[PDB]
Structure 1
């Protein structure tokens, strides 16, 4: 939220779910954030550097949390031949 002179007001811009793009409430204590390790030349997980996601309370409570990750994984290329678009 901008203001009169393009100055940035509003005291915090919340996260958004990676699978429903819906706001993560300040008290969404089911909301999750998974950091996934990225690798280099064979094994050796590069520390402090992740491919990171965020799932909503809602999705996780629906049991869709896993399946959303598989579609989110392959998409950023973390899996191959797991998630299927057609079913």
Structure 2
């Protein structure tokens, strides 16, 4: 939130899930942050560079966390043919 002069009021602008856009609550102790290492040419991971994926607690509880992760992985190019939009 902002006031009239433009400085940013309200603290800790919260994160959102990468599958279904929803604010991750502070006490929502069911949401994990998936980190994927980046390979480059030689086939070795480069420490420090990660592909950050966030999944909310509700998606994990449903059991669609695996389905969502492959969709994001395939969309960003991590995986190739593990997902099918026209199921």
- Normalised by the length of structure 2, the TM-score is 0.97
C-alpha separation in 1, matches of 2:28 and 2:55: 11
C-alpha separation in 2, matches of 1:10 and 1:4: 14
Q: CA deviation at 1:44?
A: 1.3
C-alpha separation in 2, matches of 1:50 and 1:76: 13
C-alpha separation in 2, matches of 1:3 and 1:58: 33
Unaligned runs of 5+ in 1: none
Between Structure 1 and Structure 2, how many residues are aligned? 87
Which range moved further: 50-59 or 34-43? Answer: 34-43
- Normalised by the length of structure 1, the TM-score is 0.97
Q: CA deviation at 1:41?
A: 1.4
SS at the partner of 1:52?
strand
C-alpha separation in 2, matches of 1:12 and 1:2: 13
C-alpha separation in 2, matches of 1:27 and 1:84: 34
Q: CA deviation at 1:42?
A: 2.1
CA offset digits 1:9-66 (Å, max 9, x no partner): 1011010000001000001110110010001112110001101100000000000000
Unaligned runs of 5+ in 2: none
